[PDB]
Amino acid sequence: AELKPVTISGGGFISGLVAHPTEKDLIYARTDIGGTYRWNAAKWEWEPITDFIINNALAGNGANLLGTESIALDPHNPDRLYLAQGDYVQWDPWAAFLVSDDRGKTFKQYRSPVPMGANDMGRNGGERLAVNPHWTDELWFGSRTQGLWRSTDRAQTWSRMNQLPDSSTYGIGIISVIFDPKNVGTAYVASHAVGGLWVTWDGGANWSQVGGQPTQWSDWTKSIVAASGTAIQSSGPLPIKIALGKNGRLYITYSDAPGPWGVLYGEVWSYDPTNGNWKHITPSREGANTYPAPTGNKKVVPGGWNGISVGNGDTVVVSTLDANGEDSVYLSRDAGNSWKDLGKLTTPAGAGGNSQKESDAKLRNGTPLPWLSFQNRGSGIVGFGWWLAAILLDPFSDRLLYGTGAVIWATDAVSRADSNQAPSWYINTEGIEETAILVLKSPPAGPAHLFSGMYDLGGMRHDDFSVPQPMYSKPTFSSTDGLDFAGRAANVLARVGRNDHPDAGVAGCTQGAYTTNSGDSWTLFQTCVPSLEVGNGGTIAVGADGKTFVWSPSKADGKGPYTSSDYGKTWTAPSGLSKQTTGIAADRVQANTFYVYVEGDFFVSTDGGKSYTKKGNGLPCCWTYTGTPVTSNLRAGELWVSVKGVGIYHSTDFGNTFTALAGSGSSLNPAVFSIGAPQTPNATETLFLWGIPSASQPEGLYMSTDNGGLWTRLNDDAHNYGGATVISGDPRIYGRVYIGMNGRGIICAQALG
């Protein structure tokens, strides 16, 4: 099977960026939910190296492993790669280290003795795993909850270094661990706490706080907490990240909160291990040598500091955190005595916030990322970027990368800033898909084979899979939590979501819209369904007619799904059914008929949702299961119900009668299930599954052309992507499935090569 992205390109948080100190082009990116990527300089493409991972494995007992907490390189051996993997301190029962001798082509996995938090607060902070350069079997790891840990067997086994006192905010921990490449046995570790800079000269046997470090906020900071009226959240600077220049100089970024959102203040310092000198280096502070001149407005909170990368001579670059508006990257050739403000330099005359040109919002080859405009497509300007946590000077070139909550920006030449001019930029997300998708719909006709819904970017009509598309507009969604088309009116779809930016002077429900021209344009439902949460659109179904909409809010309210045959003028609660669910599907052939599977019971409406009747004889018959109805594209009253963890059931009589597919109630364990075009015309439709399909087949993507007698494997052991959480077949192409995942975007899968 050919497996390829449905291109969005990036779309989520880049949490770190690590270069090799000796090997040109050897660069990795970590993401919070989406594993790690290895840069390919030749193909000019980021390569996903962790796609073998399954989150929450259906077999036995797994965790959210896809998220990468930390990347560490062996400075004397470029072939080596170590990853710390695991999303959640709170939610995950274990975490793991990945060790590779071949740049992440292959890994061995070892159980972590401590939990990890790639998707937690302070992930924006700044390298917890580190190889001892003077003894490369030894690695340290700054844990979120249990101090500094040490391995002397290449990250296989681990013991706590009790000799480092850990007062750090529980769950953020020791955010940043660095070895002194020049002085054997010298190392610095940054505890997230007041006076959190710790040093060893003993190779980690003894520790003491670095003498002289700021334990309270500077007068400059205090002056702005007083001018702005808004309080600091800490009594002293809190470390986010630390790094040693080749000049020997130690740089440290501080904030008043761990980040990546929620910071209000911060500072940047340098420290000189040669003479104990501290300098306050913060680029936006009044006083020291920043061009263009800092706004210097003390009325607004400045936010704090995150990123650090060091280069040649006394070159260092740093980035803000939550300065949202002033968010920027700064360049010094100076160890911080003076700076260029890269954000301002690139901001076109007459833009409030630091911005990039919209005409620059494109990959190096010129393909645009229209969605990066959000609600302001055509304005000429996009944000310079937010959550500028991860920044990187290429140690072997003049490139500078910076990550955002959405993309990587890059320049091939940062040195233009030396002559007071803006570097030339482009987006450098080739190969990265970090979206968390919510819904996939493939209508049986029209200009597109796939419409998507997802967190933070809304979703898109995927006209062309090879290239990024614009997100929905008018209305623009932050999320689209529900979406569906009409089976026999494919030009009509409905869209349901969180709308952070309602269109000015447009009447009706901002959280909900329908199209009659395949999403060329949308119009708001005249009124919102009752009980609609602001942060979540719920689930819509569109009757085969295109004339009836069933709208289930995302929370319970003591009613069942609401119906409308007047485009949202009215929403009427049903008889028979008094529960809200995601488990709704419309018939694709007969109008005004909807199927509902909620807490173990099955319901059908033939009157457009006005009234339902409990049916579904043959379905698993006692507990309160969750499950998904899926309707045939070809025949009325033909459907399946996938019961999560238990089985898949097939009806040809509108749900009066359901027949278990083979292995149902034993080896069959579906997570997500879908239908697509049959192999031969008007045979039974082909099935697709992410899950365990039989007793001798592992969790993966499968298809069946004989109603579940035989499941053929579509992916492989290296192509799991965390596991699919969304799935849609395609009614016009046999053997085609779309899988969406939580942090790896959308893969398109096609049976033969």
The CATH number for 587's domain is: 2.130.10.10
603 token code pair:
């319901």
The whole-angstrom separation of Cα 193 and Cα 553 is 43
The whole-angstrom separation of Cα 700 and Cα 719 is 9
Contacts with 504 (C-beta within 8 Å, 6 or more apart), sequence order = none
167 token code pair:
């007062």
Residue 16's DSSP bridge partners are 30
Q: Residues, the chain, total?
A: 753
- What per-residue string of b and e applies to 196-235 under the rule 16 or more CB within 10 Å gives b? bbbbbbeebeebeebeebbeebeebbeebbeebeeebebe
Q: What is the number of domains present in the chain?
A: 2
Backbone φ and ψ of 556, nearest 5°: -70, 155
507 token code pair:
């009447």
Q: Judge if 316 and 191 occupy the same domain.
A: yes
DSSP track, 237-282:
-EEEEEEE-TTS-EEEEEESS-SSS----EEEEEEETTTTEEEE--
End-to-end CA distance of the chain: 6
The whole-angstrom separation of Cα 482 and Cα 441 is 10
Q: Judge if 441 and 414 occupy the same domain.
A: no
Backbone φ and ψ of 228, nearest 5°: -80, -20
User: What letter would DSSP give residue 359?
Assistant: G
Residue for token pair 């993507």: 701
Backbone φ and ψ of 650, nearest 5°: -120, 130
- 628, 619 contact by CB (below 8 A): no
- 12, 37 contact by CB (below 8 A): no
The CA angle 124-409-82, to the nearest 5 degrees, is: 45
Find how far residue 187's CA is from the centre of its chain: 33
Q: Judge if 528 and 661 occupy the same domain.
A: yes
296 token code pair:
């210097």
- 740, 440 contact by CB (below 8 A): yes
The whole-angstrom separation of Cα 82 and Cα 132 is 13
Cis peptide before 475 (omega within 30 of 0): yes
The identity of residue 454, as a single letter, is M
Domain containing 361 equals: 10-434
The whole-angstrom separation of Cα 241 and Cα 237 is 12
List the catalytic residues: 32, 456
Residue for token pair 């090997």: 23
The identity of residue 266, as a single letter, is G
The whole-angstrom separation of Cα 48 and Cα 104 is 9
Q: Judge if 564 and 663 occupy the same domain.
A: yes
The whole-angstrom separation of Cα 488 and Cα 34 is 37
The identity of residue 581, as a single letter, is T
- 131, 138 contact by CB (below 8 A): yes
- 753, 2 contact by CB (below 8 A): yes
- 470, 489 contact by CB (below 8 A): no
Query: How far is residue 384 from each of residues 349, 364, 387, 557, 700, measured CA to CA in Å?
Result: 14, 17, 10, 42, 40
The whole-angstrom separation of Cα 741 and Cα 745 is 6
The whole-angstrom separation of Cα 632 and Cα 586 is 10
CA torsion through residues 738, 743, 745, 750, sign: negative
Contacts with 457 (C-beta within 8 Å, 6 or more apart), sequence order = 8, 11, 371, 406, 435, 471
- H/E/C letters for each residue in 155-224? CCCCEECCCCCCCCCCCCCEEEEEECCCCCCCEEEEECCCCCEEEECCCCCCCEECCCCCCCCCHHHHHH
Cis peptide before 260 (omega within 30 of 0): yes
DSSP helix/strand/coil, 36: strand
The CA angle 311-317-320, to the nearest 5 degrees, is: 160
393 token code pair:
């000077």
Q: Judge if 427 and 474 occupy the same domain.
A: no
Contacts 24+ apart (CB under 8 A), 147-152: 147/173, 147/174, 148/174, 148/177, 148/189, 148/204, 149/113, 149/114, 150/204
Q: Judge if 292 and 359 occupy the same domain.
A: yes
266 token code pair:
């911060």
- 627, 673 contact by CB (below 8 A): no
Residues ending a continuous segment of the chain before a break (C–N > 2.5 Å): none
Q: Judge if 153 and 293 occupy the same domain.
A: yes
Element (H, E) at 228: helix 219-228
The whole-angstrom separation of Cα 534 and Cα 553 is 10
The whole-angstrom separation of Cα 62 and Cα 281 is 45
Last residue of a domain, which of 378, 404, 434?
434
Last residue of a domain, which of 387, 410, 434?
434
Query: How far is residue 605 from each of residues 545, 584, 622, 637, 681, measured CA to CA in Å?
Result: 14, 11, 22, 11, 29
Q: Judge if 404 and 445 occupy the same domain.
A: no
- 187, 199 contact by CB (below 8 A): yes
β 187-191/36-40 pair status:
unpaired
Q: Judge if 305 and 348 occupy the same domain.
A: yes
21 in the Ramachandran plot: left (φ > 0), alpha (ψ -120 to 50) or beta? alpha
Count of CA atoms in the C-beta half-sphere (13 A) of 526: 9
The identity of residue 86, as a single letter, is G
Last residue of a domain, which of 370, 404, 434?
434
392 token code pair:
């990187």
695 token code pair:
């007793």
Residue for token pair 């990187």: 392
The CA angle 602-607-613, to the nearest 5 degrees, is: 30
The identity of residue 402, as a single letter, is Y
Residue 713's DSSP bridge partners are 702
- 392, 17 contact by CB (below 8 A): yes
Q: Among residues 647, 752, 657, which one has the least CA distance to residue 708?
A: 647
- 565, 547 contact by CB (below 8 A): yes
Q: Among residues 569, 578, 615, which one has the least CA distance to residue 593?
A: 615
The 10 Å Cβ neighbour count of residue 275 is: 6
Backbone φ and ψ of 687, nearest 5°: -105, 150
β 613-615/601-605 pair status:
antiparallel
- 531, 489 contact by CB (below 8 A): no
DSSP track, 368-414:
B-GGGGTT-TTSSEEE--S----EEE-TTSS-EEEE-SS-EEEES-G
Residue 639's DSSP bridge partners are 631, 651
User: What letter would DSSP give residue 362?
Assistant: B
Q: Judge if 545 and 477 occupy the same domain.
A: yes
The whole-angstrom separation of Cα 282 and Cα 270 is 9
Find how far residue 160's CA is from the centre of its chain: 31
The identity of residue 91, as a single letter, is W
- What's the CA dihedral at 682, 663, 728, 631 to 10 degrees? 50
The whole-angstrom separation of Cα 73 and Cα 78 is 7
114 token code pair:
């401590």
- 252, 271 contact by CB (below 8 A): yes
Contacts 24+ apart (CB under 8 A), 564-571: 564/525, 565/608, 566/526, 567/514, 567/523, 567/525, 567/526, 568/508, 568/509, 568/512, 568/514, 568/524, 568/525, 568/526, 568/527, 568/528, 569/526, 569/527, 570/527, 571/527, 571/528, 571/529, 571/530
- Name the CA radius of gyration of the chain, rounded: 27
Query: How far is residue 348 from each of residues 360, 401, 406, 600, measured CA to CA in Å?
Result: 12, 20, 21, 58
Q: Judge if 480 and 399 occupy the same domain.
A: no
User: What letter would DSSP give residue 450?
Assistant: -
DSSP helix/strand/coil, 226: helix
Backbone φ and ψ of 181, nearest 5°: -70, -20
90 CB-contact burial (10 Å; exposed 0-12 / middle 13-18 / buried 19+): exposed
- Experimentally determined by: X-ray
- 254, 307 contact by CB (below 8 A): no
The whole-angstrom separation of Cα 119 and Cα 104 is 21
225 token code pair:
């907490």
DSSP track, 634-668:
SSTT-EEEEETTTEEEEESSTTSB-EE-TTBTTTB
The whole-angstrom separation of Cα 269 and Cα 267 is 7
Q: Among residues 339, 382, 337, 335, which one has the least CA distance to residue 358?
A: 382
- 345, 354 contact by CB (below 8 A): no
Residue 599's DSSP bridge partners are none
- 190, 198 contact by CB (below 8 A): yes
The whole-angstrom separation of Cα 341 and Cα 703 is 54
The whole-angstrom separation of Cα 705 and Cα 680 is 9
The whole-angstrom separation of Cα 121 and Cα 106 is 29
- What's the CA dihedral at 39, 44, 49, 51 to 10 degrees? 150
CA torsion through residues 358, 359, 361, 367, sign: positive
Q: Judge if 3 and 74 occupy the same domain.
A: no
Find how far residue 183's CA is from the centre of its chain: 39
Backbone φ and ψ of 222, nearest 5°: -55, -35
The identity of residue 299, as a single letter, is K
Q: Among residues 410, 289, 431, which one has the least CA distance to residue 4?
A: 431
The 10 Å Cβ neighbour count of residue 551 is: 28
Residue 667's DSSP bridge partners are none
